[PDB]
Structures are given as structure tokens and as C-alpha cells.
Swiss-Prot record, chain C:
<feature type="binding site">
    <location>
        <begin position="29"/>
        <end position="32"/>
    </location>
    <ligand>
        <name>ATP</name>
    </ligand>
</feature>
<comment type="subunit">
    <text>Forms a cylinder of 14 subunits composed of two heptameric rings stacked back-to-back. Interacts with the co-chaperonin GroES. Can form asymmetrical complexes, composed of one GroEL and one GroES, and symmetrical complexes, formed between one GroEL and two GroES oligomers. The asymmetrical complex is the functional unit. It was suggested that the symmetric heterooligomer may represent a transient intermediate in the chaperonin protein folding cycle.</text>
</comment>
<feature type="modified residue" description="N6-succinyllysine">
    <location>
        <position position="50"/>
    </location>
</feature>
<feature type="modified residue" description="N6-acetyllysine; alternate">
    <location>
        <position position="116"/>
    </location>
</feature>
<feature type="modified residue" description="N6-succinyllysine">
    <location>
        <position position="33"/>
    </location>
</feature>
<comment type="function">
    <text>Together with its co-chaperonin GroES, plays an essential role in assisting protein folding. The GroEL-GroES system forms a nano-cage that allows encapsulation of the non-native substrate proteins and provides a physical environment optimized to promote and accelerate protein folding, probably by preventing aggregation and by entropically destabilizing folding intermediates.</text>
</comment>
<feature type="binding site">
    <location>
        <position position="50"/>
    </location>
    <ligand>
        <name>ATP</name>
    </ligand>
</feature>
<feature type="modified residue" description="N6-succinyllysine; alternate">
    <location>
        <position position="116"/>
    </location>
</feature>
<feature type="binding site">
    <location>
        <begin position="86"/>
        <end position="90"/>
    </location>
    <ligand>
        <name>ATP</name>
    </ligand>
</feature>
<comment type="function">
    <text>Also plays a role in coupling between replication of the F plasmid and cell division of the cell.</text>
</comment>
<protein>
    <recommendedName>
        <fullName>Chaperonin GroEL</fullName>
    </recommendedName>
</protein>
<comment type="similarity">
    <text>Belongs to the chaperonin (HSP60) family.</text>
</comment>
């Protein structure tokens, strides 16, 4: 295709206009005074959201160069949300600040590569500073605060997630799903979780979240890979009139002899899914036995001799709900038999007691933790479908923030930690004055979150920025109550991982992206 | 198609406008102060790169004549990257200089093919001069410098590749692949390398790099060609529900009874690849036996009598990663059995000990070198996908540059050695005054790299060119530290092959290219 | 009126277009086999000429840049004409060749004023060499042939110029008049010549001729400046009573007297030169 | 006519476009290797010139904003011309460099007026540095060289002006005239000069010349205001009966008399040129008495009683020639007796002796200087009237540049003065980063003329610039012979005053137009 090619300042200004559009569209959602935005959906109702990443995904400009810049910054939100699930808006704001100031410097005549290297030096120094300043998160009150603040100062969901992590432990799995009443409910039912994903991206359902859900699925388990379609056709055939969608768990699933002809055979009324089995050998076999007992099913093996053609509907497992994601797949509620589940739990506990090898002990302890923790289910209760998915977004963001906080720790909320590390990093210098200018641009950039939150409050940013810079420790500006105080006392806290990942991704993409002079695109 | 035909100066100026667009878009990436570009991608995120040859590949102009010029100079970068993998930007810059000055001479009325002969005489003299001035590369410090400078003065990757060539020797194979952490990692694992390529260009995966990759492939080996599809259908059928993609190694693979119906069978969910077996007869059989033992597989033969229908999933080989390229195909990691691999290594060593024929000894020594060197794997660790591929590009460029340097030698970096050989060639004269002016055009063109690098630094190109021309030996201008000194001492060195190939390709295409009077295109 | 600028090679190719237009339009008629060129007239029949000056006079192009290039070459052609009297086609043909090759060379990237200096040196050498190659024309026969060739190969004109040349010697003065008879009339009468032009171009009675021809005029001789026309009022009254053309020779003529004389000339009451 | 506004960076880029247009159009002809520029005339042949003033005069753009930018740079060029007389191309080239880097820097988000203050500080330091580096031009050989270079490398003109100052000393008054002979003529005749211009621009007989040149006029001296033209009615009648040009010198001229004189001049019935009365009070009256002695005239005053109406042809002064400049009037070969002039010289010398006030003593000293020194006349000699007037113009601006040189000093030409000063000022800093970048913009802009003239040579600007920077003292690049050396040795010099004024007004207009945010203009119609 014939290419329009732009050089230097023209390319950079088209880039920056597109990036400014996207960053405004995302930054209008930041902070407790953050304001939700409407994303058009052609198939259904318009979607309200405070979730930055879905927004940033939805932007696509008409001018090709502006669109390219917007895609480059959409990468920031995508990477940030995948890493942490929160702070994508923060990452985008840090981006926009860094690109704007770096482009001003470059327009002055600056070398962009030295800016890049200075930005890297400053951002790594900031990573070390936040690691020094990170505080462990505990007491179930800090976690509740993280959830509440993450959900736009929603105390009910913060309390609910605090109760959930109290019950299932700091490492238990919690699932957010559609509720039925007007109230959000907690349902900790028996379930299972294994770190595997779908084999083919054609199993993605109508929702664009990337996780496919099954309405009362039918569980099939296997450790030995079958050979021909005809051996597993009767099971499908039985499934084809069982009533319930089929999820198969195997060591590794092909595309040729399953996916192509299940797509060509079925138009998609009732879905069929196939997933990998984590582990290998005896560990995988024991895990499959545990899953089969949880779902009331059985595991086919060469040694047993029981075959797929002999397998019936009652022999195999069944679950009440199953959600499959690329990162990790969970069976939400497998009915099975409660007495059988308890007997298997006792058997695996005695397996722990007899075992003495460190690897065997730790994997069996992982098994008992998975069985005992269960799955917490969040029934998002609200009046409407728009409020359904909006509250789902805020609840999932709160859950992800709590996860990251217990993974790494917490620091002062509202970007105050950025102010403090910027004050601490004022002395960092680069190889030359060029790298010093880059570090100073990064310094100027890290107060962007506070300024943008205060702007979302309608208050003037520079006043608050200087007021916090005059402060120290955990003194900052509660935007919700429009007053200065200690966040740690009042519970405005960010997870350390969220902040660190956001700043890291933003610095990396911005440093690459301000060094760009030739832009080549279709006309 | 109706042809618009342009003659003489208007044709040549449209040509030159297109060439100038492409050459600017490539030359903005040269040197340590070289600055990255953005190439659009329709399927995914925009690609920020410093790789000049890619920049050449995605340039196409709206005016047909300008598009011709751009394509004919894109040929330069393609040929240069194929030959050496670095210096494509240098080749394009030498082109643009030569075409512009030759067009000025032709606009004066000067005869084109005598200019061509003068250019060839000068460029062959320059080849001999650089061969005289080439210095062998060794000590693992010069290699590290070549890698670092090749990767835009990136010292960490230079140290890493120095360690890699220290471990796997100066001739071992090194693979660059996607990493997982934020850090670039070195993983020297057991693998195989053999100079063979894919049979059909329809096996090219989604990446446009031309090398297909397989995630957990399944290895099949053969020395006797099967006859019918039905004999090898069960293996495929077994593969069709094995879980892993199938790579077949054979003497020579057909298209009629494999490729057509394997494209018609699968839609591209899981790939199936077939490659040629290097060598012939007993050498090919021994290589297949070695590869089957490396992957834990077996080789089908008429003498053995074991048949494809009798072959099972456990009988055949399996690898962790395999990347197939047209030039050379490598199995990155075949698990197999470490004890079996060591036993095969000892057996082949004893085969060396018993053998005395020079050809047998050298091929068995090639076998033991391939087995002992293994495969070095570079896990490109970075924050983002854009930084994934950008760091991959710079690391691969460093790899190719180090390969070329150890293949042929090194000279002064930044074109300083090219300046020196230009100074040494001031006395070369052609058959007539026309050829003399052609030689002088080549002479005035060979200072293009230094000028363009210094311009990328934003500095005064003329003072640097004159200062270096006043200098001698390895005295030149470090662009990174903006100062004049000895390149050998400060480690800025080019591979001799890269520079020689760039100048040869550029001179050939440019002299052949400035002779063009008529241009015939679609309207 | 605002001004539109054009700088760079685009301007150069523009006056190149203009000079090519004018230069071809005038070079067609060069030589004895010079082809006719027809020129429109606002009224009546269009004139048909082989005169390079005549065709070169009215060349003026619609767009301003090539018009201005045509005007520069028109300037040099008329300057050579007033310097020499002939060979204007030759001058502008030489101009076309030199400018075309010069613009080709400067567009080829050489230094323009270095080129100009080289051309100046070459043309100076050509000038001195043509002094070396020059041959005296003191003979009346070559005078007859050159007068013939200049006047469109008319031997009668060259012959008459030869006889007049013999009449007034080497540095005499020859003046053309109109004869009522079908034969040309050659005479020698004492007269006065001095290199002085008219105060105003409006004094010319015949615009095509370019000179003021007066028959039996009263001649006034003055060595003083005519600052006021009141000094010329009795002179005008006397010459109007007598009824003949009037010629004035004075040291200087100021704006007032010149303006009043111009007004009187366009009135049609007196003939004053 | 309605008014359209454009504020913000759009206005900035707009006048940047305008100044780039005009600045290139004038920078092409800079230097001895300056390329020709062709300009259309509404009638006849187009003019071809190397004069920066000429090309800069008729630049105006179709759209209003860049036209305005062109007009600011035009007015600064003309202001420097009237201040100095030469180097207008230099001033506007410096203007282009300073404004382009300044607008680039302000568009980079930093404070424009911090930048302007920094540029002002840097240019003030440059002014004091060039004062330090200025060399006296008392030597007649350097005077001949600078007169040569100013008048397009014509050694004859510089030589003639050199002998002119040899005739009338260091601070004498010299007027160029037209000589009928092919040879140049030089004479010295006692005359008058004073800093007074015409009442109306319509008094100028030659619009291209800009001055009123009159031969053998009747001169009227008055110390009173001409409120009514009825006072000038008998004078007009007498001068119309006599038939010569008329000069009026009066204290003030009101609107009525000026309008009536303008009507009379455009009628074509009389030649009347009126100028103000120079000086003030008793000094003005005394020097008007001196002028009356020089021309044989009489001073008319209301306080004395004798009025403008009671004027005869004998009472008015007379002279052989007069030239009334734009703000100056000079009288050559006055009729009045030299003995009376010598007596007046003695009287004002005794006034000097009895003078006690320094101001009055200096006024009497300049009175005796102008009354005794006289005026040199240089009559240009040539064959053609066209080259007559062209060499006359070359003499005019060459001598004006020579006077600028004599008043202040001379430095090596070719812009290397600016190059050396920029070398000596690399160390100065400002109060913040924006003042520092303003200093840097001024520094790297004041080096532009060398690069532009080398461009005009056809060579590479940067190599010559850095080589001359490396060279120290008066070492630089002869553009004429296109080779290095000392320009003093080969006589390539520029007056200190012209370059100093050029850079001063360039920095002034840059500081004023950098700080342009709102740009109002009339509507496109
Ligand atoms: N009362 C408050 N005072 C100060 N900062 C607050 C307050 N409430 C919330 N914040 C800050 O607002 C941010 C949370 O807002 P929000 O969840 O909308 O965006 P995010 O965490 O940057 O990312 P995302 O777009 O994924 O939601 C955190 O930085 C938190 O510290
Ligand atoms: N500090 C430096 N000083 C001088 N030259 C340098 C310096 N750093 C790098 N170079 C030169 O820059 C070039 C490497 O730049 P780069 O890798 O972008 O381009 P390339 O090698 O010409 O080709 P390609 O487009 O394939 O990368 C080499 O010629 C190297 O000598
Ligand atoms: N031989 C020379 N070598 C180098 N520079 C020279 C030489 N002769 C003159 N110059 C420089 O060239 C400039 C003279 O340019 P030019 O004669 O076109 O007019 P100007 O003085 O710049 O201005 P104006 O427009 O008022 O005529 C001066 O800056 C002078 O120093």
C-alpha cells in the first residue's frame, strides 16, 4: 500500500494530538472525583465505565498518525491492566505528561535518546525508592481500604472483599459474577483453580473480557491423549444430547482434529471448550483424580482400561459454572458429593502427613489449600444491566488491587508516594546535562497523578501540588473530603505493584516513543 | 494495463524524489544518535524500530515513479540485510549520495555508463583497500564492542553476546527469542542446527520475519521417502490429537500430496511443517539418527522395517522450541534424554577416533561441534511489547554483526575506515574523463556515512568530515561523546564484511540505476 | 498592489520559459531565409514583418515571471539596437543559447557566479580576438554590399549609401528624406549637427519615425535656462503670427516650461521642438 | 473595514513565515558574492539590483499576517539604513536568525520576555565588546578601502571621497554633484549646512534622489511663523517675475501656507522649497544672520518689525546651488561676499573668546567651523547619464558609510567582527535558564552573516565559519578572492557604527516581535 510518510515535527505533532485525545479520554476517570465515560457498543446498550483500560482500547482516531499514537498509548493501558488490573489511568497520565514534556524539549533541539536514558535512570531510581518506601499490607483493614479506594471510595465492596480474603485467606481465589437481586452478595462455594488457559482464541465468548463462561458445564477429564476423533465422538454425541456444555481437561489439545471441525460442525448455540492440565505425570494424574472427585467424574487412563466410548453422562463430572481465562482457569462450583469431597480432603491430608519430600509436601499443601479455600463468588447486585457491568468493573478493580497489595505492599494513595520519591530523587544526575534534563522531565512528570486527580475534583492543581511538595512522609491531599492529612490514617493507599508497574511501563513506552521521527502509514 | 511512459529528466526527478523519501526515512536511524521510526501495522500495535531494512520494506509511494525509485532502493537494504544483517542504513545512504551526485552529473550531460564503469572501478579498488585494512576480530572484547555498537551503544547486550560466543565458541549458534521477565537472559541449552530451509513459502507464520516458530513441536524423522498419504495419515492422525505441532524432516518434501490438502484440511489452528534433511546417504542417515536421539525419537528405514503406521506418539521425537528459516533450520531445545545425548556424543567421539579419512573426520568433527556447542537462547526481557520487538531487533543486529565480524574482520567504526580508504583512492583514474568523474562521484559519496551520523547528532557535518580527512589511521569522531579520537581504542568498529557488502551493493545498484532514461508504469 | 515572490530553481526555469518564447519568436526571422512573422493590430490588417526589433517589441506574456524574463531579453535586444542598429536577432539568439546552457549548468549544481566570471572571461577573449580578426571597411564597395545586406539585400540602398559616403567623405553626415520623383535624389548642402535630444518624447511628430521632422522652421538660439514660459510667451506669439514650426536651443529647460510646451503641443496650436 | 485577529502560536508562525520570505529575498544579495535580484516594474524593463534596500522596499505579501511580519523587518531595515546608510542586508539577516531561533525557543514553552531580556543583555554585551574591538578609521588608506567596498568594490569612488576629506579635514561637509566631463571633478567652496528638512515631502523634485536639488535659487531668511500665504504672495510674485527656484527658511510654517505651497508646486508655476529655522532663540537668530551674510540675504523677524510682505528681490539671499536633504539643507557657492563671511567669522570667534557657558561656546565653535571650513563638492564623471546617476548613488551611500566610520571607528569587514565578538562572549550567563537560552540565541544568531556570505560564495558556510572561529584576531575569509587571510591587509573593512546599529535595531525589533501574541489585521476583501 502507498505510504504517507511524515518526518520530524509534523509526525510528532500528529502523534501528540492523538495521544492527547486518548489521555484526556482516560484521565477524565481518575481519582475519587473521577467521572465515568460512555463507550458505544453496536450490538447492545451503551457501556458506562470508570475502567480506564477498556476505554483506552476503544479509542481509534480517524487521522492515521493520531491513530498510531493512540494505539501506542493504548499499549500502556493494556500492559498495565494485564500486570496489575489497576492504575492504567495513572500509567496513561504519566505517559501523556512524559511525552508532552519530552516533545517540548525535543522541539527546543534536545537529543531524544539522552532523554530516554535519563528517564530510565530516574524511573529505576524511583522503583528502588518505592521498594524502600513500600509497607506490607495486612490487618484486613488496609485490604478493605485498598478495595474501597480502588472502587471509587465504595466502602461496601471493600468490606465485602475484606471478608472474602478473611475467609479464603490472603491467597484464596475470588470470582466476580453477575448478581440477581439489588444487593451484592458473597457466596463462598466449593470450587477449584488451576493455572492454565484456553488452547485457541476462537473460544472467546460474546463478552470481550477474554474469559469464556459456561452455563452449567459438563466436565470431562483425561491424562492420556486420545488418538482418533471416533473414540471421543460418542462422548460428544452423549454431550450433544446431554443438555450441558462440555469442558474437556487434557494434557494438550490440538487444533486440527478438534477445533476446525467443531467450528465447522457447530454454529455456536452451546459452546464446547478444551483446556490444558497443569503439571505432569503423577502430579497431573493426582490433580485430575481430585478434580474428578470434586465434580463427581472419573479420569480415563490406559492402566484402568475404562474408555471414552464406555463413558456415560453420569460417569463424567459436572459443574454449576466454569469461567476460563488465558492466565488461569477456575471451576466455580462443582457439586459432586460433599462427603466424597471431604473424604478426598482427608485422604490428601494423610498424604501430606506421610510425605516428607519438600517438593511433594509443598505440592500436596498447594492441593489442600486449593481444596480448603474454595471459591468466593461476588454476586453484583444492582438495578440495571448498565449498573450490573459498572459495579462489576469497580468490584473487579478492587479485587485486583487487593491482590496486588497483598502480593507486594502498599504506599500512600493519590500519587503522594510519587511526590515523596520525586522529592527524594531531586539529586539524581545523568551522564551529561542532557540526561539531567531527561531526569528533570521525569521529575516534572511524577506529580501528574495528583494534579489530574485535583483537576477532576475541579480544584486548581498547582496549589495542591506545591502544598504536598511542602509536606513530608504520608501527608497529602484527600480529594474526597477536600482536605490535607495523612492518607495512612485515613486509608487512601495504593498497592506498590500497581504504582511501580504503571510508572515502569509509562517510562519505557514514552522513552521509546519520543524518539520517533519518521512515521509511515497508509494514505 | 495502459502505460504512462516518462523519458529523461522528468522521469529521473520523479525517481529521485521517491528515492530521497525512502533514504531520509532510513537515514534518520543511523548512528548512536540515530533516532527510531514508527511503522504502522494494521493487525496489531505500531512498530517502533531502529532496524533500517524493515523501514525500507514498508515504504511505498503514491506516485508510481516515486514508488519505483523506493522499491529499487529497498532492494539495496534487502540484499544487504540478507548478506550481513547490518549496515542496511549505510548501504541506503551510500546509494542516495551516489544517485544524487550521478544525477547531477547526468543533468550536466555526462555519459551514464562510463560513470557506471568509473563507479565500479572505484568500488572494487575500495574493496581491495578495505581487505588490506581489515583487522581480525578476537579477544571477546572486540566482539563485545561490535555487539554493543551494533545495538546502538548498548553495553549489556554486548557483554551478553560476548559471554555467549565465549561459551558456544566463535561458530556456535545463538537464538534470540521473546523473554518473560524485565531482564534479558542467556540460556545455553541442548539443540541442533542444520543448513536447511522450508520447502514452501506458505509455511510463513504471522510474523513477517520469514522464520516460522513452533510452540512445543513434535519431531518426525525419515530417510526413505514414503509413497502414499495413507501411510503417513495415522502419524498425522496421532499428531492430530497428540497436542503438539508436527515438524517432519525428510530428504525432499513434495507439494502436491502434502501441502495442498494440509492447507485445505486445517485453517491454521496448529501448524504442520516439513523440512529437508542435510547431506545425503550415510551422512544424512547418521544426522537423522543423531537428531532422533537428541529428541528421543526414532528414524524410519526400509532396512529396519518399522513403519509409520506402527509409529506412536512416544516413539517419535519431541522438542521444546523449533524455529525454521529458509537459510538454516534449528531445533532450539530437544529434551530427549541427557544420558542418551551424552552417550551419543561419546559414540560419535569414538567414531572420530576410529575414522581417518579427511572427509569423514571433518564431517564427524562438524557433528561433535554441533552437539557440544548447543544453542544459546536470548530471552529478551523488557517492559512492553514495543520494547520486546525493539530490543529483539537491536539484539539480532548485534548477533549478525558479531557473526560477520568473526567471519571476515573489523575496521574503524562510523565509516572512519571508509573515509581512510576514500583518501587512499584519490589517485585512481578511469579510461576517460567520464570514468574519472564517476570515480570522483564515488569518492565524494563515500563520506556520506560520517556526514549522516554527525547530522543525526545534530552537529556540523562538514567540520567532522574535514577533520577526519585531515586525520589518518584510525583517528575519527566518536559521535556518542562528541569528540575526536581513535575508534579502535574506544571500540567503535564495523565488521569488514558489512561495510564491504553495503558499498558493493550500493555501487552496483546505483551505477546501474543512474543510467535509466525511460520509465514505464501504470497510469 | 501586493507582490508575489518566487525564488529558487523554479524562478530560473520560469524566465527560461520566457526567454525561450521570445527568443524563438524572434529567431525564426534571422538570416536572409528568415521566415515571416505576423503581428496583430488592434485595428485593420495585421502587419507581417521580418524585422527582429518589430516582433521583439510587443512580446509580453500572460503570467508575470516569464513575462519578466521576456522583458529582460527585450531590454538587451533594444540596448544592442540603439548601440548598433542591426543584428538584434543575432544578439537575442546568442542570449538564448548562453542563458539556456548557463541555466542548465547552474541547475546542474555549479557555482553561478563562477560560471558568470568564466563566461565574462571567454567573451572578453572573444572581443579581443574579433578585434584581431576585424577587417577595415574603408572601401566603398564593401560599404555598398553591407548597406545592401542590412536593407534586406537591396543593392539600390547600398549604392546610394556608397555615393553619399563618397560625397561627405569618411566622417560626414548623411540624412534621408522623401523624394516626390520615382528616382532617388542625392544632394550636398551645408548643415549643422549636434548630439542633443528632445526635452520630451511628446515632441516627436511621427511616433513610428522617432524623430521630429520640421520643414522651414524658425530656430531660436539661447545659452540660458528657460525657467518660466513667460520668456517664451512673446516667442510663441510671434511664431503663431508667422505660422511655421519652431525649434528651441537652450542651456536648460525646467519642469514648468517643458510642461507648458507639452500642453501646447497636444493642444495643436504650435509646433515647438 | 472589519478586523480579523489571530492570537497564539499561529500568529507566531505567521510572521515567522513573513520574515523568512523577506529575509531570504534580501539575504540572497548579501556580500560581494551577493546574487542579483530582479524586480518587476509596472512599465518597461524590470530592474535588476544587488541593493538590499531596493529589494526590501517592495516586499509585501498577499496574506495579511506574513505581510505584517515582512513589514516589521522592512521598517527595522530602513531604520538601520537611515541610522547608518549601509549594511541593511546585514541587519535583516541578523533579524532573521534571531527571530527564527527566538520563535523556536518560545514555541518550546519557555518565557518569551525572559528570552527577550537575555537577548537584550547579550546584545548590550556585544555592543560594549565591539566598542572595545573598534579600530579608529583616521587612516586615509582604510577610508579609501571602505569607500571602495561600500560602493560595490569601486576604488575610484573611495579614492575621490578620500581626497574629499583630505580637502575638508576630518569632519567637513561634502556634496556629490553631476559633472559633464567624463573625468571626476573635486572642488572646495565656502558654503552652509544645517540639520533641517522640508516641510512637505512633495517638495522633493526627484523622488528617486530624495533631496531637493536647485540651481541658482533666491533664498529667503525668516525668523517668524508664516501663518498666512498672503505674506508669501509678494515673494511668489517677485520670484515668478525673476524666474528662479525659491527657498524659504522660517521659524514655523502652519498648515495654510504649507498647503498653498504644495498646491503651487503641483501646479508647476513656481519652485518653492521650505525648511524650518535651525537652532533656538538667540543662537538661531545669530546663525540665521550668518546664513544671510553667506547669501547676501536678510533675516525677517516680527520682533524687529520688518515683515515678510515687505520683501524685495535684493533682500532675498542667493547662491549657485542648494541641496535640501530629508532632514538636512546645504548651500554651495553663496553669492555673499567672502570678506563679510570672514568678518562674521571674527565676530563669532570673539564670541567664543567671551563665551562662558560650555553649551553656548560649543554652539559658537560649530558656527565658526561651518562658516570657515566650507563644503567640498565631488562631481561624478562618466559617459552615460544612467551610470552618472548610479555612480552618484554609489558615492552617496559610500560617503555616508564613510561618515559613520569616521564618527565611531572601523573593524574588519565580512562579519568577522561579529564572529570575534561571539567568540569573546561565550562565557556570559543570565539569571535563569530562559535568559541563558536567550543569550545563546543571540550568540548563535550574531554569527549568521559570515555563513550567508559564504553561501553567496558558493562554498560551505559551516566550514568557513568554524575555521574563522578557530582563527584569532582579524583572520578570516576574503569572499572576493575566496581565500583566507587578514582582511585589513587586503582592505576589507566595515564601519563600527553600521554593524553596531544593525545588530542593535535587529535585537530591538526581535525583542518587540518575539513578544507578539495578539495579531489584529483587517479582513480579507
Ligand atoms: N480520597 C482520595 N484522595 C486521594 N486520592 C484518592 C482518593 N480516592 C482515590 N484516590 C486515588 O485514586 C486512584 C484510583 O482511581 P481509579 O481506580 O479510578 O484509577 P487507577 O487506580 O489509576 O486506575 P484504573 O483506570 O485501572 O481504575 C488511586 O491513585 C487512589 O490513590
Ligand atoms: N559512538 C559512535 N561513534 C561513531 N560511530 C558510531 C558510534 N556508534 C555507532 N556508530 C556507527 O553507527 C553505525 C551503526 O548504526 P546502526 O546499527 O543504526 O546502522 P547500520 O549498522 O549502518 O545498519 P542498520 O540499519 O542495519 O542498523 C555503524 O556504522 C557504527 O560504526
Ligand atoms: N571581500 C569581502 N569578503 C568578505 N565579506 C565581504 C567582502 N566585501 C564585503 N563583504 C561584506 O559583505 C557585506 C556587504 O554587502 P552589500 O554590499 O550587499 O551590502 P550591505 O553593506 O550588507 O548592505 P546594503 O543593503 O545597505 O547595501 C558587508 O557585511 C561586508 O562586510
Amino acid at each position: 500500500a502507498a505510504k504517507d510518510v511524515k518526518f520530524g515535527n509534523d509526525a510528532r505533532v500528529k502523534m501528540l494530538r492523538g495521544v492527547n485525545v486518548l489521555a484526556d479520554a482516560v484521565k477524565v476517570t481518575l481519582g475519587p472525583k473521577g467521572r465515568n465515560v460512555v463507550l458505544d457498543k453496536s450490538f447492545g446498550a451503551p457501556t458506562i465505565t470508570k475502567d480506564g483500560v477498556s476505554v483506552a482500547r476503544e479509542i481509534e482516531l480517524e487521522d492515521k498518525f493520531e491513530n498510531m499514537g493512540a494505539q501506542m498509548v493504548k499499549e500502556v493501558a493494556s500492559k498495565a491492566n494485564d500486570a496489575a488490573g489497576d492504575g492504567t489511568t495513572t500509567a496513561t497520565v504519566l505517559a501523556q505528561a512524559i511525552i508532552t514534556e519530552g516533545l517540548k524539549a525535543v522541539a527546543a533541539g534536545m537529543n531524544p535518546m539522552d532523554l530516554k536514558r535519563g528517564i530510565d535512570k530516574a524511573v529505576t531510581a524511583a522503583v528502588e525508592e518505592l521498594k524502600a518506601l513500600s509497607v506490607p499490607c495486612s490487618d484486613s483493614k488496609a485490604i478493605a481500604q485498598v478495595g474501597t479506594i480502588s472502587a471509587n471510595s465504595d466502602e461496601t465492596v471493600g468490606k465485602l472483599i475484606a471478608e472474602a480474603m478473611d475467609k479464603v485467606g490472603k491467597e484464596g481465589v475470588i470470582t466476580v459474577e453477575d448478581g440477581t437481586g439489588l444487593q451484592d452478595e458473597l457466596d463462598v462455594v466449593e470450587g477449584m483453580q488451576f493455572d492454565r488457559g484456553y488452547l485457541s482464541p476462537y473460544f472467546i465468548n460474546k463478552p470481550e473480557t477474554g474469559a469464556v463462561e459456561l452455563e452449567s458445564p459438563f466436565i470431562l477429564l483425561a491424562d492420556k491423549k486420545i488418538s482418533n476423533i471416533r473414540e471421543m465422538l460418542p462422548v460428544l454425541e452423549a454431550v450433544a444430547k446431554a443438555g450441558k456444555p462440555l469442558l474437556i481437561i487434557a494434557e494438550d489439545v490440538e487444533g486440527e482434529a478438534l477445533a476446525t471441525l467443531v467450528v465447522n460442525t457447530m454454529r455456536g448455540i452451546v459452546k464446547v471448550a478444551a483446556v490444558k492440565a497443569p503439571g505432569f505425570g503423577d502430579r497431573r494424574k493426582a490433580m485430575l483424580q481430585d478434580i474428578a472427585t470434586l465434580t463427581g467424574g472419573t479420569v480415563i487412563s490406559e492402566e484402568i482400561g475404562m474408555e471414552l466410548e464406555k463413558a456415560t453422562l453420569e460417569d463424567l463430572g459436572q459443574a454449576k459454572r466454569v469461567v476460563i481465562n488465558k492466565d488461569t482457569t477456575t471451576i466455580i462450583d462443582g457439586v459432586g458429593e460433599e462427603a466424597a469431597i471431604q473424604g478426598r480432603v482427608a485422604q490428601i491430608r494423610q498424604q501430606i502427613e506421610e510425605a516428607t519430600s519438600d517438593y511433594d509436601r509443598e505440592k500436596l499443601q498447594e492441593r489442600v489449600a486449593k481444596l480448603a479455600g474454595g471459591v468466593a463468588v461476588i454476586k453484583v447486585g444492582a438495578a440495571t444491566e448498565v449498573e450490573m457491568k459498572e459495579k462489576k468493573a469497580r468490584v473487579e478493580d478492587a479485587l485486583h488491587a487487593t491482590r496486588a497489595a497483598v502480593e507486594e505492599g502498599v504506599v500512600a494513595g493519590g500519587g503522594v508516594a510519587l511526590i515523596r520519591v520525586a522529592s527524594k530523587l531531586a539529586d539524581l544526575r545523568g551522564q551529561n546535562e542532557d540526561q539531567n534534563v531527561g531526569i528533570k522531565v521525569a521529575l516534572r512528570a511524577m506529580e501528574a497523578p495528583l494534579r489530574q486527580i485535583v483537576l477532576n475534583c475541579g480544584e486548581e492543581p498547582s496549589v495542591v501540588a506545591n502544598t504536598v511538595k511542602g509536606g513530608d512522609g504520608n501527608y497529602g491531599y484527600n480529594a474526597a473530603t477536600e482536605e490535607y492529612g495523612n492518607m495512612i490514617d485515613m486509608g487512601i493507599l495504593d498497592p506498590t505493584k500497581v504504582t511501580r508497574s504503571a510508572l515502569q511501563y509509562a517510562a519505557s513506552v514514552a522513552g521509546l516513543m519520543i524518539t520517533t521521527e519518521c512515521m509511515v502509514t497508509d494514505l
